[PDB]
Design a protein around this nucleic acid. Structure first.
Lengths: 369, 120, 186, 166, 70
RNA sequence: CAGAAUGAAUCAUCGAAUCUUUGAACGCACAUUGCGCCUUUGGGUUCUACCAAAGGCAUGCCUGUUUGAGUGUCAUU
RNA sequence: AUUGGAUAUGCCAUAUAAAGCGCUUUCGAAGAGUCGAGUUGCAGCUCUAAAUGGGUGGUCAUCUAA
RNA sequence: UUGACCUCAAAUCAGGUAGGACUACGCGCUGAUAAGCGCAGGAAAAGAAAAUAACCAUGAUUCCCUCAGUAACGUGAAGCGGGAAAAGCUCAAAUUUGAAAUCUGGCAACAUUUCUUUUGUUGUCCGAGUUGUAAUUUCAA
């Protein structure tokens, strides 16, 4: 008698995984982003689906039963109880118990779910690209209903800490200014990691990406950004998390706000470059700090600039605007295409090639070979 | 084997000491159907008793490590409870036995049975 | 149908098809929607303090005493609505209550069946409102049976003299013959 | 309180109010089980007077009995006490009847509940001598049945007493 | 703990961001002025618009790891 | 009797443990002999197979927790 | 070695409290299909109370059930 | 759409609980006391008067002697008196209303033990409870 073992034993359906775990669709999709499980296709799906021929998603039983002992599943159901205690409080007009329970809103911990799925920190370094990219993704858009306004500050703090620690360790090696934005390819603790960052533009809601699924996926990426910061700052001797200057944050100093206090990397180190209010100086200062160069900026570009527009210490006062009426002597106005090529070629690129009012060359991919 | 110096080594060291003590006994019953000396039937006796010492030892290194595990706990399993008598486990405790109202607390701090005497 | 639902619609209808005595007949004619939204608006100032935040003011009262300060000498007599069946029967017999509120769904109906007769005799203006649980929400309870205002402060006395006049004029002034005839048998 | 009014009302058992609730509740009590748990006592005054405090551990049951030869109230104490093997019986009173069934309720107390056991007004029933009181005729109506009272109304000779010196 | 202590011992908490250590395709040479093919060619970085498909692309890649098989 | 000898003792006491299958007998049926289900672990170079081990699966009732159902009672500008 | 009620003594306690008895220009709540009568083998069935009332005994004495 | 509340369910949910054996002695059930049925403890039943008495009054219950083979109708008491032992009381019914003052449970600390096996205290969060949990009172008042 078939229908007891073979493929149909280890392989089981999506609906059956709802029956054997006692969850719903929105409950099942909620947890398998934090915990890594993806559908697995049999080599023969008719035998595995107990003779039927419908198109049906399939799962190992060794992971769907490994899901049973997870105490985070208890936190979700004990989040169901809370809102049916808060609505009991809010629905009976008692405002004060409605305030007293939201502070003790039950929150699970993301410690033991990052323990088992990423064993090695180097393996965690290998899978830190998409999480950091997502950390750099939602950190510049407006506040969304399903997205967390407080988590937006976490997205701002985690990416800056990733920017400050990499700049302190000079981990960034390759950088390309592609059509999408500035793709930064770094290498920390041996693992070479590439992260793509877009330009700060007037974005709009796409009305098609599930922000509910995004808020869950961002929460899975919020732990890895901090845990790596807990590891990288300990590796570099800095504070995890580093002390952040709110006054410099209110003045938009970037990595200068998050003070990294201790608890060819010199391609442009001998070049104190300044900037006007014509380009994305946030990544420009990150590229300069990763390459050892002193980064200046205009007051409109942001406060905390070590070098001003009138400062004669500007080695290469790069201006994205081709018309630089205040181009100082010794601060020749160049374009970011030369600096991007300088980050690509690893040497001091020709500022006369990609100058302000000069032809920018074709920027190839730094990761390409 | 002297049971006081069995407890001076960890649990796993009692572990590999367990089977070859059996493999001696497992081999020693083969000689009974083979036929041998009479002093090994004394060795039959003292290998079972030596089997029956380490098993006493290892079991008391599990339960005594469980008791240190279940300190301070409101609930402990059944096998570590009292086994006195069913009528003793399910009867009142002297706390609840000696619980009084507030009325019989007042009536025995202003009016207790004092000690007195007479004179014959 | 399940084993219990076919009872749950039938005891709904046997209260209708039978002869309701005039004592019980008044327990279905009930204060309306409108005038039962201002009574609970006046009461929602005089709720009893929630047991969690009575303690909150008690730790703030007992911390200054542990230093030497006090507030018992300047503590004015408190206010709230008065609830509980046995405390409100004695608040009517002593002519202390001024507005008695009777739930319309007390399960053993004998618990409140003497109250519209006691309120008629002692001269305490009364009304029968819906949903015992609605009273329960007022006083932080699951199911209340009755409430009573016995003393509002000088702030709402002028409001209370008006809202009672809505209670007599709609419940007591009306409903005067349906309480004097049998009900049910529909 | 309300229990004064609810005692004198519960005596006028045949009057129009006490008869209307009799017909109504006998209907609901009859479609329910022969023994089914209450959630509140139907007579919350008689229950309060016979011993029932409204705390955890006090369980109200109610049971119909066929009319028409042990006293019916006594069997309502026994049949509920055989349906609940843990609960200790306190009392059992009359709540309703009709031409074919008498309805009673019973007050039952959990002896294992650590709220009865911590309370010195009901702690006499945790003791093991009170095991199945309704069996031994040791309760409110099992005492009245067997003529245990005070009054001329309600082997000690059949053995010869042969002393040592006689 | 008194009434002020009811307040200030709630305030050192709720700061939980990794306070202990748990560990004890590429670009196709596409840019503003890519001359390999003639997407589009952008003369100036300020003239380059915003590629709005990145939100739908990154979400699709995120949803592929959890819903699409592998 | 042999037996080892030199903490012996079919010793005494006894507070920690062991207690086979049954039996109120309790995962199901029986008188043997079986039939199963759930979770965990291990095994033999596969948890696509197989086996084993370990922990659970009687009923009634009580207290509490979670999930619900009710053309059962109502409120929601 | 476990355990008893004590004696003395040390530290705690929280007492803004609780209790005995005078004194009352004041009040004083008391258990129901039970009691009770009729009637079949203390039970069954029919009926069904009251507040100086109700019970049992010689107008009195004595008690306070459900 | 939503939210309370009532009722009813479901859970290998959390913690508990009931059977069965002995039955000399105890208490009930029917019963030709015998047999059968049920139910407990080291004792149990009984118990602080809806009791006697007709006195100059006695004073919960139990048991022995006596009353006594007596009254009353072959059956067969009881009051009084004499002993042993003596311990009394707890609720319902009155509003804590100037404040549900009450309690189970979950978690965490502190102890503590016939005992790492026992038994609690304190803090905290639900929950029970105004259809009434504590204080007060039981007619002797």
């Amino acid at each position: 008698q078939k229908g007891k073992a073979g493929a149909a034993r280890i392989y089981i359906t999506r609906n059956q995984a709802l029956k054997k775990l006692q969850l719903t669709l929105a409950d099942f999709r909620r947890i398998c982003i934090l915990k890594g499980v993806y559908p697995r296709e049999p080599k023969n799906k008719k035998k595995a689906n107990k003779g039927s021929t419908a198109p049906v998603t399939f799962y190992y039983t060794k992971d769907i039963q490994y899901l049973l002992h997870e105490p985070i599943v208890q936190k979700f159901r004990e989040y169901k109880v809370f809102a049916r205690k808060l609505s009991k409080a809010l629905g009976k007009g008692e405002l004060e118990t409605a305030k007293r329970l939201e502070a003790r809103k039950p929150t699970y911990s993301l410690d033991h779910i990052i323990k088992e799925r990423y064993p090695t920190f180097h393996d965690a370094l290998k899978d830190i690209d998409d999480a950091l990219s997502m950390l750099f993704l939602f950190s510049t858009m407006p506040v969304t209903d399903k997205i967390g306004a407080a988590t937006v500050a976490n997205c701002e703090r985690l990416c800056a800490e990733f920017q400050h620690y990499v700049i302190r360790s000079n981990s960034l090696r390759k950088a390309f200014l592609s059509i999408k934005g500035i793709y930064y390819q770094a290498e920390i603790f041996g693992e070479q990691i590439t992260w793509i960052v877009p330009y700060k533009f007037a974005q709009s809601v796409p009305t098609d990406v599930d922000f509910r699924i995004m808020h869950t996926f961002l929460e899975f990426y919020q732990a890895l950004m901090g845990f790596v910061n807990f590891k990288l700052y300990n590796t570099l001797g800095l504070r995890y998390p580093p002390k952040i200057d709110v006054a410099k944050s209110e003045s938009a100093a970037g990595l200068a706000a998050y003070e990294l206090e201790e608890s060819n990397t010199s391609l442009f180190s001998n070049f104190t470059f300044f900037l006007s209010r014509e380009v994305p100086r946030f990544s420009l200062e990150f590229v300069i700090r990763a390459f050892g160069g002193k980064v200046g900026w205009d007051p409109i570009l942001g406060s905390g600039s070590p070098f001003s527009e009138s400062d004669p210490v500007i080695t290469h006062h790069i201006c994205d605007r081709p018309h630089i009426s205040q181009k100082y002597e010794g601060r020749i106005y160049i374009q970011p295409q030369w600096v991007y090529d300088s980050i690509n070629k690893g040497i001091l690129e020709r500022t006369d090639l990609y100058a302000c009012g000069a032809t920018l060359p074709p920027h190839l991919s730094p990761f390409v070979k | 084997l002297k049971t006081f110096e069995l407890r001076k080594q960890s649990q796993e060291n009692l572990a590999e000491q367990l089977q070859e003590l059996r493999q001696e006994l497992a081999s020693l019953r083969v000689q009974k159907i083979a036929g041998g000396s009479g002093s090994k039937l004394s060795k039959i006796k003292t290998t079972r008793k030596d089997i029956a010492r380490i098993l006493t030892v290892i079991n008391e290194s599990n339960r005594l490590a469980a008791r240190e595990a279940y300190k301070n706990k409101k609930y402990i399993p059944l096998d570590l409870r009292q086994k006195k008598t069913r009528a003793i486990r399910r009867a009142l405790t002297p706390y609840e036995q000696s619980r009084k109202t507030l009325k019989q607390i007042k009536k025995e701090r202003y009016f207790p049975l004092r000690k007195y005497a007479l004179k014959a | 149908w399940p084993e219990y639902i076919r009872l749950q619609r039938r005891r709904k209808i046997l209260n209708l098809r039978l002869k309701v005595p005039p004592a019980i007949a008044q327990f279905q004619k009930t204060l309306d929607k409108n005038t039962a939204t201002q009574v609970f608006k006046l009461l929602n100032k005089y709720r009893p303090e929630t047991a969690a935040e009575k303690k909150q003011r008690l730790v703030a009262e007992a911390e200054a005493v542990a230093n030497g300060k006090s507030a018992q000498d300047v503590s004015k007599k408190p206010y709230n609505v008065k609830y509980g069946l046995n405390h409100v029967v004695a608040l009517i017999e002593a002519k202390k209550a001024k507005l008695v509120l009777i739930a319309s769904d007390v399960d053993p109906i004998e618990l409140v069946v003497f109250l519209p007769a006691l309120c008629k005799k002692m001269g305490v203006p009364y009304a029968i409102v819906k949903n015992k649980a609605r009273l329960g929400t007022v006083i932080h309870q699951k199911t209340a049976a009755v409430l009573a205002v016995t003393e509002v402060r000088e702030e709402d006395k002028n409001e209370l003299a008006s809202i009672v006049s809505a209670v007599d004029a709609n419940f007591s002034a009306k409903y005067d013959e349906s309480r004097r005839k049998w009900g049910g048998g529909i | 309180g309300a229990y004064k009014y609810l005692e004198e009302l519960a005596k006028k058992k045949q009057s129009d109010v006490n008869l209307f609730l009799s017909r109504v509740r006998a209907w609901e009590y009859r479609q329910m089980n022969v023994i089914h748990r209450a959630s509140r006592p139907s007579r919350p005054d008689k229950a309060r007077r016979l011993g029932y405090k409204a705390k955890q551990g006090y369980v109200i049951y109610r049971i119909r009995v066929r009319r028409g030869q042990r006293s019916a109230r006594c069997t309502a104490e026994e049949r509920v006490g055989r349906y609940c093997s843990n609960l200790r019986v306190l009392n059992s009173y009359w709540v309703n009847q009709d031409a074919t069934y008498k309805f009673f309720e019973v007050i039952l107390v959990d002896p294992s509940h650590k709220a009865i056991r911590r309370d010195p007004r009901i702690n006499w029933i945790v003791n093991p001598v009170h095991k199945h009181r309704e069996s031994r005729g040791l309760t409110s109506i099992g005492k009245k049945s067997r003529g245990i009272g005070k009054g001329h109304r309600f082997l000690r000779h059949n053995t010869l007493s042969l002393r040592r010196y006689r | 703990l008194t009434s002020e202590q009811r307040a200030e011992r709630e305030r050192e908490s709720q700061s939980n961001y990794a306070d202990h250590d748990l560990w004890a395709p590429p670009s196709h040479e596409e840019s503003y002025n890519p001359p390999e093919e003639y997407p589009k060619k952008y003369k100036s970085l300020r003239v380059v618009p915003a590629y709005s498909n990145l939100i739908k692309e990154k979400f699709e890649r995120c949803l592929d790891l959890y819903l699409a098989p592998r």
